[PDB]
């Protein structure tokens, strides 16, 4: 089976450089060009460039050209990308590619490699009760996961018993260079004087664990 | 440089019907076009090639067609797995540019407004010198919402920040969170904290609000 293994993840610091690695198998390693593909969160593929294994031909995309630095070991059929003076803008999903036998496709990629440039250090969330001061048919609780780095935090309800009309949404990025997230769940009204409600919020980089129960 | 104008940006549509995505090269790249589709959180993967070759495994409801320089995806009877987003890219000459994307998402038959619901900031989080009200859209449709924060009737801006869900798979909806940051001195200076809500499911724009001390 092709196959080409990439690391999950990288957090790095501004002003540094990061090598992202690519592990090709299962074909001849000297075959097939290697390109490199970026992806901003939440945003389109942007196309840095492609080398050719077996000889070490390069071509960059001038956007990136001293930006991304394009090698690799023959040897230990891997592709490497470093990626140098990292900023903000460079923390994105970064997905190696192999050619196809029409030269002309991506019929293979790696799956990503996320970068995330940032100078804040590791911090477990606060985590405060969400409940509406308040006839209506459902009711809402929540916790807002506030102030951590990095992600990402898992949060569950009930210890996992309640996934029904649970929302956690995506994270986003303060000013702090902290995180911040909501999660909540929408319940029947007549359960609120039966059933308690508890979000468990763990944030592995921390070694935090968040029990905390709201009270409609 | 060859770069490639994809449309449209998004597209919704529902099981059963057909769409076209379109890419314009910005000079001739002969045949030289692929297709991508990406899930949410996944590596993108082909669907065609030489513009108009379906690659392994692709179902024959998708297509693909040259006329020049443009280029154009057809998908015929879409069923669930097809919504996500859609990416062109060219091979003639360096750089191998993508187009911008397309983003398909399912249209729900009906239109399904916000359920609304404002939280006070805590006790605990306003010990701390900050004081951060949510205001959550649940389970609406379609995306297009506008939340407006007002305070003691005053429009507020640039101290909020929205979040949104990924459309859920089962029911077609979104939910979506916006949420109000300010400083304890801030907060205090005021009493009325409300999200107004405008949605096509709402005749009329809905309030919730909370004075400030009574919960």
């Known amino acids: 089976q092709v196959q080409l293994q990439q690391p999950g993840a990288e957090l790095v610091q501004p002003g540094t450089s990061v090598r992202l690695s690519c592990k090709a198998s299962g074909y001849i390693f000297t075959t097939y060009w290697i390109h490199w593909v970026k992806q901003r969160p939440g945003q389109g593929l942007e196309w840095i460039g492609e080398?050719?294994?077996?000889?070490?031909?390069?071509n960059y995309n001038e956007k990136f050209k001293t930006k991304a630095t394009l090698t690799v070991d023959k040897s230990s059929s891997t592709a490497y990308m470093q990626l140098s003076s990292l900023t903000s803008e460079d923390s994105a999903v970064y997905y190696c590619?192999?050619?196809?036998?029409?030269?002309?496709?991506?019929?293979?990629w790696g799956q990503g490699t996320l970068v995330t440039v940032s100078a804040a250090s590791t911090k477990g969330p606060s985590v405060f009760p969400l409940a509406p001061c308040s006839s209506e048919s459902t009711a809402a609780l929540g916790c807002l996961v506030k102030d951590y780095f990095p992600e990402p935090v898992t949060v569950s309800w009930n210890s996992g018993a309640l996934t029904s009309g649970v929302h956690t949404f995506p994270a986003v990025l303060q000013s702090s260079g902290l995180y911040s997230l909501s999660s909540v769940v929408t319940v029947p009204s007549s359960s609120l004087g039966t059933k308690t409600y508890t979000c468990n919020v763990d944030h592995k980089p921390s070694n935090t664990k968040v029990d905390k129960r709201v009270h409609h | 440089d060859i770069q490639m104008t994809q449309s449209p940006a998004s597209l919704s549509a529902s099981v059963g019907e057909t769409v076209t995505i379109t890419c314009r090269a910005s000079?001739?790249?002969?045949?030289?076009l692929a297709w991508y589709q990406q899930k949410q959180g996944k590596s993108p993967q082909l669907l065609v090639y030489n513009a108009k070759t379906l690659a392994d495994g692709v179902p024959s409801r998708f297509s693909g067609s040259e006329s020049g320089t443009q280029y154009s995806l057809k998908i015929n009877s879409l069923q669930p797995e097809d919504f996500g987003s859609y990416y062109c890219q060219h091979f003639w000459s360096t750089p191998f540019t993508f187009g911008s994307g397309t983003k398909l998402e399912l249209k729900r038959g009906t239109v399904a407004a916000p359920s609304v619901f404002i939280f006070p900031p805590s006790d605990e989080q306003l010990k701390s010198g900050t004081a951060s009200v949510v205001c959550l859209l649940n389970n609406f449709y379609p995306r297009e919402a506008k939340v407006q924060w007002k305070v003691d009737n005053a429009l507020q801006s640039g101290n909020s920040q929205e979040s949104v869900t990924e459309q859920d798979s089962k029911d077609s909806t979104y939910s979506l969170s916006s949420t109000l940051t300010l400083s304890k001195a801030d907060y205090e200076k005021h009493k009325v904290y409300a999200c107004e809500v405008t949605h096509q499911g709402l005749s009329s724009p809905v309030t919730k609000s909370f004075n400030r001390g009574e919960c």
């Open positions: 080398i050719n294994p077996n000889n070490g031909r390069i």
């Open positions: 590619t192999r050619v196809g036998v029409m030269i002309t496709t991506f019929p293979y």
């Open positions: 000079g001739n790249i002969h045949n030289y």
